[PDB]
Design a protein around this ligand. Structure first.
Ligand SMILES: *[C@@H]1O[C@H](CO)[C@@H](O)[C@H](O)[C@H]1NC(C)=O
Lengths: 16, 149, 205
């Protein structure tokens, strides 16, 4: 019931 | 460090010190970046703080924190799940350490690559863009200030 | 071999103390030790990474565990020994310690000029490493006077589930000093050491 009801966005942070 | 935004823009940012990646109605993602050597414009992540804000009936507020040489498989209060024992809407699993916030269809992957930390966030578009006017500093949404690039 | 102890229970007494109690089925009812047997209590939490179990021997069927972290979930299990005979570790019981006032300040206090708004500053920070409970708020103190008494600093209360805050209408080309403190249901934590930030000036086009 708690579970989210459709497209996903992605974020990333990484090194060098 | 290098940043890949929710809008798929790739950027190289200095962003030294504490900076918000995410600052919305459901989640706070805060990072600390340090110059690789003193005076360098090249910076890397030594601290990742994630605040899963209280979601009534699903999870109480949980805070995850990883630092260089300390990647626990639990929230700061020693718990591995949000709310009750029966409540599994928010959980942490070790492999990368992963946070599954099913209640907000959000996944957060954290790992240490060498001396620094990396982060990957998968969030539903309507939730990722659900924030108040004053929450205008969010590296994941708008990228870095021009002066930081 | 030997039957492991049963009914392991964690009684929370404070932010650093938990009393552990258990029953031994091999023992008469209730609950007299009439031989040279001794118990071993083991405990740990999941913070920081890769901790090892702490152990303690107990002469009777209870053990008071001290020096624990506040607002922390611990696991506890018991075993029995009698010279040569030794049982396995019992079913694990859990216990979370009470909250304590935060004992360390907010960290990594960073002050930046807002892009396109040089009369606005953004204050960014990290939680105290010793939050000792759910952070319910932060207090940002700021001043143009580094020597002003604390009650004369501008107060900016803030929510506990956020680590960024914006302060508007400031003077350009001016040094400002910032201190933050965390708060929980038990009260105020210590203040971070003042951080200096000089606001930018105009670059005429
Ligand atoms: C418990 O007692 C046994 C026997 O004396 C000993 O080997 C063990 O190290 C003791 N443990 C602690 C934590 O004192």
């Amino acid at each position: 019931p708690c579970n989210y009801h459709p497209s996903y966005l992605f974020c990333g942070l990484f090194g060098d | 460090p290098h940043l890949r935004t929710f809008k798929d823009n790739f950027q190289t940012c200095k962003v030294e010190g504490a900076w918000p990646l995410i600052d919305n109605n459901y989640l706070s993602v805060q990072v600390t970046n340090v110059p690789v050597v003193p005076g360098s414009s090249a910076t890397a992540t030594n601290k990742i703080t994630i605040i899963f804000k209280a979601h009534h009936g699903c999870t109480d507020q949980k805070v995850y924190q990883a630092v260089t040489d300390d990647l626990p498989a639990a929230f700061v209060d020693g718990t591995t799940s949000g709310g009750d024992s029966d409540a599994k809407s928010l959980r942490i699993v070790e492999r990368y350490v992963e946070m599954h916030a099913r209640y907000i269809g959000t996944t957060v992957f954290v790992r240490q690559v060498g001396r620094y930390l990396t982060l990957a966030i998968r969030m539903p578009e309507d939730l990722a863009m659900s924030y108040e006017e004053s929450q205008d500093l969010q590296l994941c949404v708008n990228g870095c200030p021009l002066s930081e690039r | 071999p030997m039957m492991p102890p049963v009914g392991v229970q964690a009684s929370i007494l404070s932010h650093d103390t938990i009393r552990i109690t258990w029953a031994d089925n091999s023992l008469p009812k209730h609950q007299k030790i009439t031989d040279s047997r001794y118990y071993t209590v083991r405990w740990k939490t999941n913070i920081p990474a890769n901790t090892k179990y702490k152990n303690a021997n107990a002469t009777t069927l209870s053990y008071l565990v001290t020096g624990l972290k506040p607002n922390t979930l611990y696991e506890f299990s018991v075993m029995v020994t009698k010279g040569r005979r030794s049982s396995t570790w019992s079913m694990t019981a859990h216990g979370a310690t009470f909250e304590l006032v935060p004992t360390s300040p907010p960290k990594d206090v960073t002050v930046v000029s807002k892009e396109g708004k040089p009369r606005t500053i953004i204050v960014n920070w990290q939680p105290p490493s010793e939050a000792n409970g759910k952070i319910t708020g932060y207090i940002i103190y700021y001043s143009t006077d580094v020597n002003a008494e604390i009650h004369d600093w501008v107060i900016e209360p803030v929510v506990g589930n956020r680590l960024t805050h914006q302060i508007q209408e400031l003077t350009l080309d001016t040094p400002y000093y910032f201190k933050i403190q965390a708060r929980n249901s038990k009260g105020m934590g210590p203040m971070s050491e003042a951080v200096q930030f000089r606001t930018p000036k105009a670059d005429s086009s």
